[model samples]
Each structure stands twice: as C-alpha cells, then as structure tokens.
Target: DDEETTALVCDNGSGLVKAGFAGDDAPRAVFPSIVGRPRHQGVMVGMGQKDSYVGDEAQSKRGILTLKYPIEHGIITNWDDMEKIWHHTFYNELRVAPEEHPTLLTEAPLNPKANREKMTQIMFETFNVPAMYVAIQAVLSLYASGRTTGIVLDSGDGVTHNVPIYEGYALPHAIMRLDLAGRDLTDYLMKILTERGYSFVTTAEREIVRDIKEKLCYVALDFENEMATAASSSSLEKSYELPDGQVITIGNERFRCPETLFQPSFIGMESAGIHETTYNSIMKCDIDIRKDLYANNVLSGGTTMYPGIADRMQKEITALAPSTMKIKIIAPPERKYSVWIGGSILASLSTFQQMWISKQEYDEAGPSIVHRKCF
Candidate 1:
C-alpha cells in the first residue's frame, strides 16, 4: 500500500544521506552534509561564480573558499544557517512536503535535554510537522530489522554507539557510546600521513584518504603481528589512486586498525575494545535477555561495511561469549543501506502505523510525545 508517510534520516558521519516518503523503498535524495565557496559572502564571481559547492563538492574547493559542516556529530549546531541550507536542499533536492504528510525524524540517543527540546521546538515551529518521533538510531534499527532482541552498534562519523535491544525496548545501561569513528580514523590517518611528509591542502585529498582507509584498512586479528607487518618500510611505499587522476603513496608497513578497538587510549580516548565494549553493553541488559543476544546479532551502520568486519567481530565476540552460546552476525545484502531499508520495513508494519504521530497528538501532547510516545 502507498502510505502517506515520510521519514527523514541523517548521519553526520556520512556524505551521502537518505530522506523522503516511507513507501518509496529508497531515499528521494542523497547528498553530503557540507557546503563550500571561494568566500563566505557568496560563491566566487570570477574564477568559479557558478561553482557554489555542496557536500563532496566543497571538499575539493578548499582554495576557492572552504566547506563547512553545519551539524557536528549529526546534531544541528547552527540552527539558523543549517535551517536555510536544509530547507534549500530539501525543497530543491528532496521535494518533500511537510504539511501534507506526517514525518518521522531520527536523532541520537541520550541527546542533551536542551538540544532535544530546542530541536523539537524548531520542528514544530518552523516545519509545522503534524507529528514527529525522535529516537536513538540503534533502537530504530531493531524495528527496521524486525528483530525483537539484538545488539546494534552504530559506527557513525563522530562516535560509535553500542546498543542492546530486548523485545523492542532499549536496555539503557547496556548502551555504550565511544568517541571514535570515521572522523577519528580520518584524523589518525591525517596525522600519520603528515608525519611522513604528506600534508593535505584540500578537502578532496582528505576525502580520498578516508576512502583509502575504508578500502585498504583492515582489522588486525593479531595486534602484534599486524603491527610488525605495518611497521615494515615496504608497507609505507604502498600507493593508492584517488577518484581524480591523483595517486598518493604512503609507508604503512606497520598500520594496525584493530588496535584502535583495543587501545583507544592510543587515540586519546577511554574505550574497551570492540569485543569488550559489546560484551559490556550486552551485560547491561536483563539477565534473561542475555541469552537472546547471541541469536539476534544485527550489525547495521556505515563502518560495518569494512571488509571482513563481520567475520572479525564474530571471532572476537565468540571467544568472549559462553561456550554453549551461538552467535550470528547478519549483514543485509545491501549492507550500506540496511538501516534505511529497516526503516522502510518498520514504517510498513500494521501495528507501527499509529507510531507515526498524528497532527492532533502534536497539538495536545507537544514535543514530549516524540520521545515518550514513539518508543
């Protein structure tokens, strides 16, 4: 059935985004969360007047001006500026209508109460959304996947969220947040590259480096051996070609990414390794729910796309789990879009139909309903 509904989702962690009506089976638009210009006043007039940069486009135009991300860690930072860009992009790219349909928006877990309140006010006042439901993304994944009990680790740009779900409810204590993600990885890569005399002057080069990390990076099963291998000078001489004709080489003989999971301290943060973190998060759930964790392990997020991540996580998690327990790691065929796909599934459920708050409820219950009623 073609339902009259819309779901808006964004992850500051991603350059490509998803938004639009619920039944479409795909996002109406996907773009990066960035904008650039030669000067802040406006797009350059002479050199590239028509070259107003947005998203990935801004990355390459650093010398012209520079790209700016209005949101930090997936939360709106500059409401005024971001709103203008958001509305401009939504109208121009998404072509979405707020008055005609209800909307379900996604937000981070344990968000600052003030930010949450302000965000709610903005949605109601500016967009006049009939109804809005804000939620922690990992919990939404459970609904999207139809999994009653599972652990959802959202590896976004600024932080990695470890969430445990039971019978559709979130186990708050087990939910763990780590200040590490693609952004941290990029920073680490940049520092390492700079130490080797490879300084980046443009966003394009930085973005290409991020791609290389996504493609060439691997989780080291054996930290010591992986480190030794990465330490070799020959490894540093490796070359990677960018989307453009540019080719860059680096000495990476001793680069071990898995080490980050174990020793986040190396990156100036306190975090248990992935296995430990996952175990710790799971432990926060009720004792009865612990057994349910193994069967319903669903990995949904951008960072999960790293090759061999599922297998690597399985091996590590198994050793940490009880011997009699069975663990399964599932990745939807289109791993990149699993969360969004799950959102589509959730929106289609009969019971969930009312989950989309109606205009009447917004007027009566106000924004508080977003957090209370949605769950």
Candidate 2:
C-alpha cells in the first residue's frame, strides 16, 4: 500500500497557507493567513456566538469584519485562531480525512519550541493524525530549488527570511530576517497615493494598493541613476483608474515601492536591505561554505515575483560580494509557492517515508520527541 497513503504537505506562511497532497505540482490554493470576526456583535446573530471566517470565505462576505492574522513576522501569536486556521485547512480547504494520511508541515527559521510542541500536540491529539513531520520553510525552499545547499531569500506579505542551508541542514546562526516585506511595499504605494490627494482612508481601501503595486511596481536594475534619469520623466508614467472613477498617474513610485526591499532607507528602516542582509548572511557562515552559499542563491514567496527581482538581487549582492565569489540567482517562474513545492517534493520521496513520526511513537515519547526526531 505504498501508494495507499499519500502524504499531505502543508506550508503555512504569513500571507497564505498552501496545502495539497505530496507529488502534486502545486497547492490547491487557500490564501491569506487570516481569521476574521465581525465588527458588530449582532452580525453573528443567526450564526454561532464566536462566529468567524477564514480566508476566501471571510473575504467573500466583506461585512466590515476585522481580520486577526494569527501569523506575524513568521510566528503564531494566537494559538486559538491558528487552530481555527489549521482546522479550516483540514476540513474546508483540503477536504481531507486527517486520520488517514501522514502530514508534513512547514515552519519559520526562528520558531519557538513551545509553539512547535503545541502544534505537535494538536496534530497527534486533536486531529488524531497518523504521523507527521515538521521542518523550517528555508530547508524546504532550498530543496525546491533542487539543491540541498544554497541561500533561500523568502519574502511574503508580513515577513522575510534570508536563510542559508548546507547539505540539507539549515544553518540557524547565519539566517537573517527583515521586518518589512510585501505589505510594507503596498503601504509605500498607499503613502505615495495619499500625498497625491487620493482618498484611500478605510482598511478596505488598502486592498486596492496591493493590486496597483503588483501590476506596476518593479525592481529597478540601477537605483540611484534610474531615479535621477527617470525623475526627468518619460515612459515612467502610468495610469490606473480608482474605484471612484478617478485616475492617478503612477510615476517613479512604481520603482520606488519595490526599491524599499533593496534600499530600506526609502521606507525609513535603518537596518540593512535585502542585498546587504543576504551578503552579510553569507559572510557569517564558515569560509569553506560561503562559496556554496553564494553559488546558488534561490528566490522564494510571492514578493520575489517582481520583475527584475532576480537580476537586481544578483547585481546588488554582486556589488557587496568579493569579485571571486560568483553569485547565481535561481529564481524559478513558480517561486511564489516554492516552500509548498519543496514540501511536496520532499513528502513524495520514497526515502522520506521512514522519517515521519508515527502515532505510536508520539504516544510513547510525547511531543518533545519532535525536536529530536524531526529537526
């Protein structure tokens, strides 16, 4: 019955939770890691008292609901709401019988032990899953790149992780994180629009900013010179009609939005930008492994979908890296779900079959066994 039990790989990010069976090409597509509760208590009259919604379901009704995002900067702060998301993933999203299949789940580079244990406890006890495995998204993202050793610079809506993996092992010491990511870029556009006298005052209006950014924003290959020359205007100007039938010209702000990733000074962040963080991460590793880290720099998550992202990253990092250290950016076209894709690839492997922690083992040693077994 080798084919009898298809493992379910779940990659939960700050932006989306991608869940699908192993060996599948991509996730079945559940999006936005959010749980929503209605603003007015009376809105849940016909429904249950704690009546809430998840993702697309929550998005469909748009009844002035306030969304409580469980994951922030790659950590889950609200376990109750997180359990809600996990439940929805199993029941509503995947429509899977959790008890039948072995599970593979992804985590952050710096996830806490207590959170890990809590999740393990849930899978075995509440869900009554047969077996499970948990690993950081960085390692899985690297594996998706078809290499065991490389740097995975993954940035989603809320967070960014520039992690280095060596021979299938994630080097925690060398991993770096940036606080600002995709939504911050969206906010950058909102800031520019607000100055231009656009009325985007409500939380719902913020959603419009992301669509505009994704459609127009791109990483400039050369920042300083492009801003100077482009500031002189030309094809740099573009127009997008707002919901209120008002048209606004998107100028250098298009490039400036994504520029924050390379130069955080644009967003008022004093810390190093992506290139600086990535290069410094490589430097932090052992000298022998630095070349390996530099050789194959992989891109991950939706934020890296920006045009010229790979080129700009390679170019900027090349500036900081030693001349001899040849940097190559492997940015696949389907990198938006690279972490999930990696888990799918890993879970589908015959060799990985023996690695899952069975229910018997869970009962014997308890949740603490995860750290020793899975990690």
Candidate 3:
C-alpha cells in the first residue's frame, strides 16, 4: 500500500500555498494563503461543509467578508486559520484523504522549534497523516536546482533570505535575511497609487495591487540611469486596467517598486541590498569554498521572477567579486515553486522513503521526534 501511495507535498509560502503529489513538475493547487468565512450563511456543496471559502474563492468575496491570512511576516501565527487552509488544500482542492498519504512539508529558514513540533502534532493528531517530513525551504530550493552546494537567494512574499548550503547541508551561521520582500513592494505600489487618487479600500483591491506588482514591477539594470530616464519627458509608461475597469498608467513606479530590494532606504528601511547580503553570506562561509558558492548562486522564489533581477544581481555581484572569480546566477523556469518542486524531487526518490517519520514512531516519541527525524 505504501509503494502505491503518492506522498503529499505542501510548500506553505508566506503569500501562497503550493500542494500536490510528489514527482509532479508543478503543484496541482496553488493559491493565496488566506481563508474566509462568509458573514452570512451560504449554499452547501459536495465538500460536506458550508459558509466558508479558501484561496481564490475566499478572495472573491472580500467585499463582504474579512479574509484571514494565516501566515504573517513569513511565519504561521494563527494555527486555527492555517488548519482550515490545509484542509482546503488537502480535501477540497487536491481531493485526497490525509490518512492515506505520507506528507512532506517545507518550513521557513530559522523557524522556531515550537512551530515545528506544533506542525507535527497537527499532521498526526488532526490530519492523521500516515507519515511526514519537514524540509528547510532554502535547502529545497537548492535541491530544485539540481545542486548540493550553492548560495540560495530566496526573495519570498514577506522576507528575503540568503542561505549557504554545502554538500546538501545548510550552514545556518551564514544565513542572512531581510525584512523587505514582495509584500513590501506591493504596499509601496499601493501608496503610490493612493497618492495619485486611487483608493484600495477593500481586500480585493489590495489583491489587485499584488497582481500588478507581479505583472508590472521589474528591477532596474542601472538605478541612477533608469531614474533619470524615468524623470525625463520621454519616460516609459504602461497602463494596467484594474478589476474595477479603471485604467492606471505607470511609469517610473515599475522600477521604483522593485528598486527597494536594492536600496531599502527608499522605503525608509535600514538594510543592505540583496547583492551585499549575497556577498556577505558567501564571505561568512569557509574561504576555500567561496568561489564555488559564487559560481553556483541559485535564485528562487516569486519575487525573483521580475524581469531584470538576475541580470541586476549578476552585474552587482560581478562588480564586487574578484576578476578571477566566476559569478553565475542560476534561476529555474519555475523559480516561484522551487521549494515545492524540490520537495517533490526528494519525496519521489527511493532513498527518501526511509526519511519519512511513520505514525507508529510518532506514537512512541511524541512531537519532539520531528526535530530528530525530519531535518
């Protein structure tokens, strides 16, 4: 029975949840990490429940209800809402019974030990999953790139992390993080829109802002040169039609939005740019391997999908590194789901079968067993 069963892989990113069977190239279910309960009763369906929604459906009813984002600042802060989201992904979306599937989940770098134990308790006690394993998100990103050694730059929804991995192991001491990320860029976009007389008063409107950022924002190849071009009379502009049918024209905002990643000071945050962080992260590692780490720089996460990010990172790092050092940036085609993709790769391997913690083992050792068995 175990041989035939497909392990469930869930990558709970700050902004979205990616869940599907192992060995799949991409997640079957991808949606925002939010759940909504209607203020008023609604019709029932085959789901065996009513009056609530998850993912895109929940977001659709934002005008009449308050949507709860279970994860805040890249951490699960509300277990109740997170449980609901997981149920939606497992039962409603994936159409699978948790009891029959072994599960593999991705966790944020430096996530609290308590969070890990609580997740294990929820999977075994609540979902009754047969087996489970939690993998570090950055490590999974590296695995997705088909590499065991590299510096992983994950610019996710709520935070950006630089993790150095050597021989398939994450060097925690060399990890660097920034408070700014996709959400911050979206907020900055909202601010600029508001200043121009557009009001994002509803959750739905905010979601539109996020979409705009994904579709429109991009890194500037040369910040100062782009700034001057944007300020000139011939500044480039693009028009985006909002959900409400209002057309908003954007020019310099596109470059300015993602520029914060290079200069947090633009948003009044005192933090080093992503390139500096990448350089420093490699420096913290053993000097002998620094060259390899630089050559194998892997960029993953949704935020890194911007048009000029890779080129900008390459340019910045090249300027800082020695002339003899080769600087290469590797970004996968599906970088946004790299963590989940890696988990899928790991779970599908024959060698990984023994890595999963079985329910019987959990029964004997309790939640503390996760720390010992999963990492």
Each candidate: what lDDT?
A: 0.65, 0.82, 0.86
In model 3, which runs have C-alpha deviations exceeding 4 angstroms? Answer: 1-3, 39-50
lDDT of each residue in 193-303, candidate 2, tens digit only: 776677565556666787799888888998888889777857788898876687888877788889888778878899888888998898899889989888988888889
Q: For candidate 3, give the lDDT of residue 240.
A: 92
How does model 2 score by TM-score? 0.91
In order of appearance, the predictions have TM-scores of: 0.85, 0.91, 0.94
Which structure is stronger by lDDT: 1 or 3? 3
Best by TM-score: 3
Candidate number achieving the greatest lDDT relative to the actual structure: 3
Positional deviation of 116 in candidate 1, in angstroms?
2.5
Better of 1 and 3 by TM-score: 3
Model 3 Cα lDDT, one tens digit per residue, 18-74: 999989899998988877776745566574644567787877677766676888776
Global local distance difference test of model 2: 0.82
Q: Write the per-residue lDDT of candidate 1 for residues 126-180, one digit (tens) a residue.
A: 8776666555677666766767788887776656788888876766767788767
> What is the full ranking by TM-score, best candidate first?
3, 2, 1
**Residue 230 in model 3: shift from native, Å?**
1.2
